[PDB]
Amino acid sequence: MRVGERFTHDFVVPPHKTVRHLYPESPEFAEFPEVFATGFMVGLMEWACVRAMAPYLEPGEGSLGTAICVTHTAATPPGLTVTVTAELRSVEGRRLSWRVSAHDGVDEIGSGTHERAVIHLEKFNAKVRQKTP
Amino acid sequence: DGMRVGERFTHDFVVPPHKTVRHLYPESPEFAEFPEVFATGFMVGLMEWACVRAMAPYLEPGEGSLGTAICVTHTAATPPGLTVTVTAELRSVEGRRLSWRVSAHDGVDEIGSGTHERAVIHLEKFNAKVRQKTP
């Protein structure tokens, strides 16, 4: 995997990726404006990075998000297409650092950095199995 | 009043099965086989929720807020059934912009921390703007 490697993916915002859909159990969010939630944008950023690195993972391997540092500079109603671009900026063995950026066809909506660590899936699941209630 | 710098709100949440990674984007084939852990996008929303709850007594009627930045590590994984405690500490207020230090632990591990910034908005003004760009 090479530094400068870019990947791009598009996503038409559906009604069910607004703030209130992120936490339906939240009365405090229930009457927030109908805009693409930051947490959903983060997941879209993660997803772009996961797709870009998938052809470089061995079988039995996966990855986890380890950091997210982004702005969220404009709001997006449902119906717009959000284009995320992910550019690999660093590879420190198991650790990958992406510059992530997103626009909704009208505005730049956010950018910053996302980081990921490559895991062995079997060894990781055992670790979480043993802190599960 | 006005909000006081250094004041803390904490906020508890039992992670249910439906706040795992494959539940953030059910439409994602690429996520459908991820381990069953609390998604970063859900932790981020939990942190916003803590900050929103802390701010609410201080907003004028018709006022709300939007997150404008998030900068957090996510350092341990959390299966469903553990309680995530989010701590939001107010760092600064500069007119409409507030800065928060956000922190989370799942009873076993510290799971993440960093910063979150929000902006106070006039809800109906903002909605009218949002419509100007709906298709």
mmCIF file of N, CA and C in Angstrom, chain B residues 34 55 81:
data_model
loop_
_atom_site.group_PDB
_atom_site.id
_atom_site.type_symbol
_atom_site.label_atom_id
_atom_site.label_comp_id
_atom_site.label_asym_id
_atom_site.label_seq_id
_atom_site.Cartn_x
_atom_site.Cartn_y
_atom_site.Cartn_z
ATOM 1 N N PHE B 34 -17.987 -7.002 10.340
ATOM 2 C CA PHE B 34 -17.163 -6.435 11.388
ATOM 3 C C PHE B 34 -17.500 -7.048 12.735
ATOM 4 N N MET B 55 -25.586 21.731 27.704
ATOM 5 C CA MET B 55 -25.840 23.090 27.184
ATOM 6 C C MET B 55 -27.287 23.549 27.317
ATOM 7 N N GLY B 81 -23.625 -4.501 26.173
ATOM 8 C CA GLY B 81 -23.818 -4.901 27.568
ATOM 9 C C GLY B 81 -22.983 -4.156 28.591
#
